[PDB]
Structure 1
Amino acid sequence: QLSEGAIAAIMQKGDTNIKPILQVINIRPITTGNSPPRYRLLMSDGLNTLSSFMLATQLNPLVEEEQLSSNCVCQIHRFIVNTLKDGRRVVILMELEVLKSAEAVGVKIGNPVPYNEGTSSGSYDIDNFDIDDFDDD
């Protein structure tokens, strides 16, 4: 049911027109100050996870209403990939539909490894500088 390999497709091939089915692993606000929340997401395609997702603030009602939460499965309908000054490419989710609630799925799907650290095959890349989890937690 998840679009296995879609995270690599977005990050490696630049595919911006695909509509993949992903699982939300974690949601977190970018800052905790007194301001309208802006959420970052750790998403999974079942093979890899990627933490460089931001939810467009127009979609915040999905989070405030608890429709989008950890372990739910959603389909992305529109996104763009933006690059920060330091080089990091961040996927901005603009439109999405929750297909299965967190409660309905019940559990994390598969055994995904972080995209920065490993392959879609479940193995970890050679990391001679011990740095490739820098953008994960």
Structure 2
Amino acid sequence: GSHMVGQLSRGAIAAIMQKGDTNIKPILQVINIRPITTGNSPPRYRLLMSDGLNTLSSFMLATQLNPLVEEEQLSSNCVCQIHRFIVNTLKDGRRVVILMELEVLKSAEAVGVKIGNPVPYNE
């Protein structure tokens, strides 16, 4: 409905990446999904997500959620609620958000466009 960015948890990306907040259950839009190079192991999916203010590509899906991508329930433009996630910090200082539980609130086909004009998060 009208004011589409009002459907997303504006400010959640900054909160996750800076405050270390893990209790929140933010609503985010998937902008893009791409497989990461793996080899002899299940694929892993990396996501460019939006909270309506920022985009951030430092999300990965827990492999238990792979069927959501492979059966096309989780795809570009869908709106999702993150019910459980963890944050990992790499040796170089970058942070990665591993999505453990999520719910698709609106399918990609029911949304159909990138919501708002989010700008890349500066980590």
Structure 2 counterparts to residues 41-56 of structure 1, below 5 A: 41-56=47-62
Deviations 1:2-36 (A, max 9, x none): 01111011112111110000000000011164642
Question: Which region of structure 1 is more displaced relative to structure 2, 51-60 or 31-40?
Answer: 31-40
Unaligned runs of 5+ in 1: 118-137
Task: Give TM-score, length-normalised by structure 2.
Answer: 0.91
1:87 Cα deviation after fit: 1.3
CA contact (8 A) 2:37 2:43 kept: yes
Equivalent in the alignment of 2:87: 81
Unaligned runs of 5+ in 2: 1-6
Percent of aligned pairs sharing the same letter: 99
- Larger RCO, structures 1/2 (Cα 8 Å, 6+ apart): 2
1:85 Cα deviation after fit: 1.6
Specify the structure having the higher radius of gyration (Cα).
Answer: 1
Q: More helix by proportion, 1 or 2?
A: 2
Q: Distance in 2 between matches of 1:3 and 1:63?
A: 22
Question: Which region of structure 1 is more displaced relative to structure 2, 83-92 or 103-112?
Answer: 83-92
Determine whether 1:91 maps to 2:97: yes
Deviations 1:65-95 (A, max 9, x none): 1000000000000000001122111000000
Aligned to 1:54, the other structure's residue is in SS state: strand
CA contact (8 A) 2:33 2:45 kept: yes
1:55 Cα deviation after fit: 0.3
